[PDB]
Amino acid sequence: MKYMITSKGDEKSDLLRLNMIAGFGEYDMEYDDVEPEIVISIGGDGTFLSAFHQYEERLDEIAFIGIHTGHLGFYADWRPAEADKLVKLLAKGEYQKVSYPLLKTTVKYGIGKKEATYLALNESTVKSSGGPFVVDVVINDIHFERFRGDGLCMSTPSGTTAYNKSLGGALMHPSIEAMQLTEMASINNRVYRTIGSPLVFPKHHVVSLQPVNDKDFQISVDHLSILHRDVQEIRYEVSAKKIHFARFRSFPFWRRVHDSFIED
Amino acid sequence: MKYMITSKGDEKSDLLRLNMIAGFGEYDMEYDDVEPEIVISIGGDGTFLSAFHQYEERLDEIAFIGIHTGHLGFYADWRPAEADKLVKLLAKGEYQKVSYPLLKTTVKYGIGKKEATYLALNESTVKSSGGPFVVDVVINDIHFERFRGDGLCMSTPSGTTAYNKSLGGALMHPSIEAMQLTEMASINNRVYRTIGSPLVFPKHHVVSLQPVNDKDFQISVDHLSILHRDVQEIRYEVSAKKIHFARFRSFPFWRRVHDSFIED
Amino acid sequence: MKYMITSKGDEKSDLLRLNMIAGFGEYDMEYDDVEPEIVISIGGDGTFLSAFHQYEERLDEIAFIGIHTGHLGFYADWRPAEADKLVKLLAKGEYQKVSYPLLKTTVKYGIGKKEATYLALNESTVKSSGGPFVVDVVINDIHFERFRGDGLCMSTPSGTTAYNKSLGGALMHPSIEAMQLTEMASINNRVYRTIGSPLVFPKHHVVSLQPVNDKDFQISVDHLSILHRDVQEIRYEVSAKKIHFARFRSFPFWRRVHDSFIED
Amino acid sequence: MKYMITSKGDEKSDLLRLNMIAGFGEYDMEYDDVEPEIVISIGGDGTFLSAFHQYEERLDEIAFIGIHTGHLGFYADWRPAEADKLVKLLAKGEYQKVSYPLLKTTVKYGIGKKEATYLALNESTVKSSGGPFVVDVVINDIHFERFRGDGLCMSTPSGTTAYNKSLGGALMHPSIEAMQLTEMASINNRVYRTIGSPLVFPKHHVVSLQPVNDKDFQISVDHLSILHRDVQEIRYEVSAKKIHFARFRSFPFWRRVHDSFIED
Ligand SMILES: Nc1ncnc2c1ncn2[C@@H]1O[C@H](CN2CC#Cc3nc4c(N)ncnc4n3[C@@H]3O[C@H](CNC(=O)CNC(=O)C2)[C@@H](O)[C@H]3O)[C@@H](O)[C@H]1O
Ligand SMILES: Nc1ncnc2c1ncn2[C@@H]1O[C@H](CN2CC#Cc3nc4c(N)ncnc4n3[C@@H]3O[C@H](CNC(=O)CNC(=O)C2)[C@@H](O)[C@H]3O)[C@@H](O)[C@H]1O
Ligand SMILES: Nc1ncnc2c1ncn2[C@@H]1O[C@H](CN2CC#Cc3nc4c(N)ncnc4n3[C@@H]3O[C@H](CNC(=O)CNC(=O)C2)[C@@H](O)[C@H]3O)[C@@H](O)[C@H]1O
Ligand SMILES: Nc1ncnc2c1ncn2[C@@H]1O[C@H](CN2CC#Cc3nc4c(N)ncnc4n3[C@@H]3O[C@H](CNC(=O)CNC(=O)C2)[C@@H](O)[C@H]3O)[C@@H](O)[C@H]1O
């Protein structure tokens, strides 16, 4: 089929990419970076996140694969030495696909009335423009809390091992269609009160963050982060869209967690 | 239908129970504490947990209701003043049912070879008999970690607001069929290593705790706690069984969380 | 003596300030905001922090007092209704003084070679300019760790109830001459490793933060926060200087903690 | 001088002990385990804790040394290969001494009226006899909080790297004369409230734990743990007594922390 290979850009990953392209030339495989059906990422999890956002408009037509030239990644979970066996199985096809849930983020603005939507593979976070961060947290149209602190992080399941984990969040197996909200340095005293605990939401629950004082926020989506002005609302929901991985062996999530944090 | 009412045993709850029995006498409602179809608990969440374990062999034939004579409970979420409206709607029927997932705990012994199974509505925990607690944690037959510490807690979704919450766990909406494992004071240094983070498992995942040095453990299931000796394995899995609640109004889980921890 | 009164600027605090000035006019008390010996702050803890940094060059010649027109503050711990009794005792004098330790922050730059020093009453923090925050942490010239995360917070004892507390830090009685370092969302996996725990340092210990990749950081000192460029080192040490409070009654730190976080 | 050597009891530590005794026989050094002035512990930190409590009645007449035959310990911080150089320097004398603060625990009983005092090198903890743990926490005769949870831990400075650390406590340099209180799984909801944060107390502050419902508690002091009945009060204070170490090289606390938790 059609395929493309993205590279971290260092000597190691570029050469592996050129050797894989040569190996694909021995099969009915066409290099196409406009409408690929297979997207191979060579580098780390950062490289894999860039590949996902490169092709986020053709998610349902693409199976992703990650190769780690550095340490083991959670998305880039193939070794460089397995590259030749990867070509053959990819060329033959008949592989299985695995799907992970994604996070939908909607940003509504003031001035007039317009929206922007983004898809996250790891998480979306909200912080302030330097000043104090105060937002009302609304869950399914019910006011839940007034958050004062540094920010908030909404993670996908496969994102729970990333930023979510550093904030105290739970690690969730990616077969659970859910999103998880964690706090960044919340203020809790006699007059200010947050839940503290991470919150895990199922499909069709909508979490809305609404400004109190300032309308300017730093909003990140995976590695992309930008200052949004005149923001009226930020809505989080489990996406109906899913990222599809090509799978060729059993590499269970909990072993990947074991290998990344316990020992390898 | 057939119904029974359990009471915390204080003057307030006993009198409310006698007044509800009188109110049921005005309808085709028969008091039966052997094969009830409706189980009303009057007291707190402790009273409701005792009612659940009272009738755990007829879970699929019972709809539970909780009335809180003290503060708001997560299971006992009806006010005493609503008792009269409760009788009528219960007597008429046509109510909806809501189902929450449960936790299955299997305890395998040595000596010969035998098993015991228990059902938890909140959580099951494992601690040592005074000595150091060391257990190997195995996830789907894969050795995940060697835990050294005070103990481990496996929570249901509706249990996440209880012991799980005090241990740093995430709060999970009860519509998610999952269980959550949290650590109690894990030892982490150069030679000893745990994941630290809470872990959230889906249906059909099996978490096994296996002894290393001692075979004696204090194992709790909700409020019940007992010293198990000659223990070879403790297995945790999302139960196929569910507790059914009678519902008459919308009282969302996240508002119940709000009312219990933020403000009311 | 000479005295000045700073105000939050709202109607309540301005009027209390004018009434106290009138009350001081009945005694040998001269209003002087250039070389005061008594500095009264009327507002909240934010107002008190501004007063401290207003007069940080004459710390050893000044006794500070805080009045809270809003809720109880940790520095602004007098009620407005006590204002008249405050004037008399302040005018008579013979009061006792209480001293709290402070934090010294030294910022060394590249380009050529120059330093800047700041004094913190609550804390000093370090974050990155948007990009990833990576710094080497050196304790008394010994490399202790390579920190990857959102940032670091170095707190005084009286600062431990502020930002430090939201980051998981311990609350320290202000009679202990010490500083406390806490982490903001540290990355910990197989290859990256921080201590995790807050660290409490005594007098004469020097903690140095040294850049790895980028030399630009957002450095805050109490409420003041600014982007420092070409930074070569940030050094933290318990200051030899102390802030002096005028005290007229016993209001113990742990009761102030109780009143602010438990109940009042 | 007079000296004794305690051993973990395994083949490695016993043989090292016999070789050191032989080496001391070449100097004016007398083996005496009744009134030693030098106490050498060969094993791990557990072995060193037993040696401390062995000779806790002659603390001011004893300099302790630890040798680790397993991994590095915080008290047993000499390698076995350094044993011969240890003998010579110990025999010659002229060494320096380093002193660490200790924790005093007083247990007052009912029935009649009697007290017991204990000294801790790491920590003292309080847990319940199975039932719920509820205690009133009083700081310098001021009621601070009503604690509901699994238990409480009061740590010395050198104890902060042990149990305290697993409970979220700060690591404190042992030159600070202080004690640190940490919570074990506190209950916090609308009606029950604890501070949450670790608390660090200076010398002469007295923390008192007082029973509410039950008078039976499991009280530990370092590795010793026993069920106390008819308990009326448990009082914690920084001891006036100090443990003295013989020091022959610079091995800073923060490097020892680095070596034990970061890398070695
Ligand atoms: N204070 C913070 N703490 C923890 N994580 C933080 C964080 N601030 C941001 N992030 C994460 O960085 C992601 C953006 N980076 C790409 C990635 C990735 C990635 N994904 C996963 C995953 N799913 N599971 C487990 N580890 C994962 N990692 C690893 O994360 C590490 C942290 N990153 C950096 O040091 C520098 N950042 C980049 O190069 C861009 C990397 O080594 C990476 O291998 C954000 O999306 C956020 O999650
Ligand atoms: N260290 C610890 N920290 C936190 N929770 C702990 C704990 N040790 C045990 N538990 C919990 O106690 C349950 C057993 N108790 C019945 C219940 C219940 C219950 N269920 C839920 C729920 N689903 N969500 C939210 N709050 C819930 N609560 C509330 O929990 C409080 C704590 N309990 C006690 O003080 C005394 N214990 C009992 O009377 C028996 C009560 O006020 C209660 O209203 C265990 O199952 C475990 O969860
Ligand atoms: N993510 C964060 N979490 C927690 N604290 C954070 C934080 N980011 C910054 N800070 C603190 O704010 C201080 C700067 N503010 C003045 C003050 C003060 C002050 N001092 C003490 C003290 N010693 N003990 C106990 N509470 C104290 N507080 C209270 O702190 C609250 C938080 N502040 C805000 O909401 C808005 N900020 C300001 O108006 C300026 C206030 O209600 C205040 O009454 C920084 O110095 C840092 O500490
Ligand atoms: N849930 C818990 N989490 C963390 N620590 C816990 C704990 N429950 C008890 N403890 C500690 O055990 C001490 C009693 N043990 C002797 C020691 C010691 C010692 N002292 C220090 C120190 N100062 N700094 C840093 N590490 C230190 N350690 C190390 O601690 C480890 C934990 N221990 C065990 O696994 C088995 N226990 C024993 O053999 C007896 C050991 O490897 C040891 O090398 C208690 O005093 C309490 O602190």
Side-chain angles (χ1 to χ4, degrees), chain C residues 31-76:
Chain C
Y31 193 97
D32 185 329
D33 63 0
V34 184
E35 292 192 318
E37 300 177 354
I38 301 298
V39 172
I40 308 168
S41 158
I42 302 177
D45 286 330
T47 311
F48 186 96
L49 257 56
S50 296
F52 167 80
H53 290 283
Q54 259 192 237
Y55 295 97
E56 51 186 356
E57 279 78 26
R58 287 181 60 259
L59 282 185
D60 229 281
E61 305 152 51
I62 290 184
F64 293 90
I65 297 127
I67 300 171
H68 64 86
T69 47
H71 56 88
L72 176 63
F74 271 86
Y75 303 117

Side-chain angles (χ1 to χ4, degrees), chain A residues 132 148-150 184-187 189 192, chain C residues 45-46 49 71 74-75 122-123 158-164 166 222-223 261:
Chain A
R148 304 155 206 267
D150 286 357
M184 313 178 179
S186 53
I187 308 168
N189 54 38
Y192 305 148
Chain C
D45 286 330
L49 257 56
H71 56 88
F74 271 86
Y75 303 117
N122 273 348
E123 75 286 309
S158 62
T160 53
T161 43
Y163 207 164
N164 168 90
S166 291
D222 293 333
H223 51 306
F261 300 109

Side-chain angles (χ1 to χ4, degrees), chain A residues 115-129:
Chain A
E115 286 185 351
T117 62
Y118 307 85
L119 232 45
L121 172 55
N122 273 348
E123 75 286 309
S124 175
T125 71
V126 187
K127 301 166 179 171
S128 74
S129 331

Side-chain angles (χ1 to χ4, degrees), chain C residues 176-189 191-192:
Chain C
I176 307 157
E177 296 184 291
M179 61 182 174
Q180 183 174 182
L181 178 76
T182 55
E183 307 182 342
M184 313 178 179
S186 53
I187 308 168
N188 279 269
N189 54 38
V191 304
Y192 305 148

Side-chain angles (χ1 to χ4, degrees), chain B residues 71 127 150 163 165-167 184-189 191-192 259-261, chain D residues 71 127 150 163 165-167 184-189 191-192 259-261:
Chain B
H71 56 88
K127 301 166 179 171
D150 286 357
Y163 207 164
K165 174 167 191 293
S166 291
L167 299 166
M184 313 178 179
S186 53
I187 308 168
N188 279 269
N189 54 38
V191 304
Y192 305 148
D259 289 344
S260 288
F261 300 109
Chain D
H71 56 88
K127 301 166 179 171
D150 286 357
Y163 207 164
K165 174 167 191 293
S166 291
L167 299 166
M184 313 178 179
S186 53
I187 308 168
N188 279 269
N189 54 38
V191 304
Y192 305 148
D259 289 344
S260 288
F261 300 109

Side-chain angles (χ1 to χ4, degrees), chain B residues 52-62 119 241:
Chain B
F52 167 80
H53 290 283
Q54 259 192 237
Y55 295 97
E56 51 186 356
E57 279 78 26
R58 287 181 60 259
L59 282 185
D60 229 281
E61 305 152 51
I62 290 184
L119 232 45
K241 302 170 180 182

